[PDB]
Amino acid sequence: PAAAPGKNFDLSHWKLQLPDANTTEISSANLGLGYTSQYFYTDTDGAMTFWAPTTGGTTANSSYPRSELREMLDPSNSKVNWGWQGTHTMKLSGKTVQLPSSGKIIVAQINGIMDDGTNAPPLVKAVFQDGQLDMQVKQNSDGTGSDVHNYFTGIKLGDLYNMEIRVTDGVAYVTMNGDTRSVDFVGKDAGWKNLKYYFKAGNFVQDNTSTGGSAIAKLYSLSVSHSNLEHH
Numbered sequence: 452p453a454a455a456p457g458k459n460f461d462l463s464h465w466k467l468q469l470p471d472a473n474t475t476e477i478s479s480a481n482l483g484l485g486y487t488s489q490y491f492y493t494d495t496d497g498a499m500t501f502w503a504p505t506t507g508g509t510t511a512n513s514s515y516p517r518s519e520l521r522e523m524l525d526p527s528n529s530k531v532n533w534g535w536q537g538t539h540t541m542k543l544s545g546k547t548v549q550l551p552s553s554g555k556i557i558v559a560q561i562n563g564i565m566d567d568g569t570n571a572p573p574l575v576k577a578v579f580q581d582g583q584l585d586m587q588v589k590q591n592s593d594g595t596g597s598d599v600h601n602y603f604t605g606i607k608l609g610d611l612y613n614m615e616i617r618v619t620d621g622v623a624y625v626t627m628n629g630d631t632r633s634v635d636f637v638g639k640d641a642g643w644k645n646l647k648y649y650f651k652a653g654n655f656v657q658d659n660t661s662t663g664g665s666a667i668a669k670l671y672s673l674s675v676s677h678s679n680l681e682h683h
């Protein structure tokens with residue numbers, strides 16, 4: 452059989468959040484020891500693959516189920532996260548294979564979090580629909596209001612995509628297939644300076660209906676880097 456995703460990808464700085472009844476989380480170490488299930492597996496094309504049904508368990512402050520990685524700077528402490536200053540970059544390649552009845556899933560994020568671990572709004576959501584990825588960047592740190600939309604069209608269900616999400620000094624740069632857009636979020640709302648952040652990647656299903664079906668998203672490559680000095 453294929454190597455489990457964490458015995459292939461280096462997942463030593465991710466934990467996995469699942470859509471089972473209990474919304475089980477799989478630790479970095481357990482991922483590295485080969486955790487795999489119906490929700491999380493290496494497919495025949497080598498992809499780390501995330502499956503979640505619309506009927507799945509959901510986290511405390513979301514109505515939607517996920518099979519999704521959550522960045523862990525410290526694999527044993529989810530309260531260790533990064534800030535608006537410096538350069539913080541996630542790069543991935545992936546594809547969305549199957550959608551729920553709503554036709555929408557979220558395949559990558561930056562989630563906000565308070566210093567003490569308390570939940571906060573997402574800053575960036577990569578929303579996939581058949582034919583369109585919308586890289587949404589939240590305007591208000593307090594979670595009110597709406598998002599700035601960044602549309603990348605022509606990306607079909609089953610198409611391989613290359614993505615980057617980068618924060619440098621409170622500006623978000625969102626890229627699909629070499630097309631980069633930028634949103635100055637700290638410039639818009641200084642309150643973002645008060646929040647911390649972490650990356651997410653996987654399958655956050657924007658459908659919780661009993662008859663909604665399920666979704667599958669895939670990752671072929673994945674990297675996160677944090678730096679205090681970037682070179683030309």
Ligand SMILES: O=C(O)C1=CC(O)[C@H](O)[C@H](O[C@H]2[C@H](O)[C@H](O)[C@H](O[C@H]3[C@H](O)[C@H](O)[C@H](O[C@H]4[C@H](O)[C@H](O)[C@H](O)O[C@H]4C(=O)O)O[C@@H]3C(=O)O)O[C@H]2C(=O)O)O1
Pocket residue numbers: 468476510511512513514521529560562564568570571572573576594655657
């Ligand atoms: O624009 C929006 O606000 C956005 C659009 C959506 O369609 C969707 O509702 C989205 O959801 C956000 C929101 O912030 C929501 O509260 C939730 O946050 C999660 C978060 O991603 C993460 O999983 C967090 O994990 C916590 C939690 O205590 C878990 O039980 C576990 O122990 O891990 C913790 C940790 O690692 O910090 O849970 C949050 C939660 O639901 O409490 O999802 C957001 C998102 O995924 O974008 O809002």
